Amino acid sequence: SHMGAAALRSCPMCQKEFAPRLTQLDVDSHLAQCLAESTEDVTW
Numbered sequence: 900s901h902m903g904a905a906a907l908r909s910c911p912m913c914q915k916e917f918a919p920r921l922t923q924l925d926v927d928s929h930l931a932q933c934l935a936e937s938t939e940d941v942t943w
C-alpha cells in the first residue's frame with residue numbers, strides 16, 4: 900500500500916522538525932503523542 904507504511908523525518912501534524920540526534924524510535928514516540936492529542940486547531 901502507498902499510504903500505509905512510511906517513514907518521515909518531521910512531524911507534519913504540528914509542523915515540527917525532528918533533531919538529527921533523534922532516532923527512528925524518537926520520531927514515532929512524538930508521532931503517537933501528537934496524534935493522541937488530536938489538537939490540530941491551535942488558534943493562538
Ligand SMILES: [Zn+2]
Nearest residue numbers: 910913915933
Ligand atoms: Zn507533533
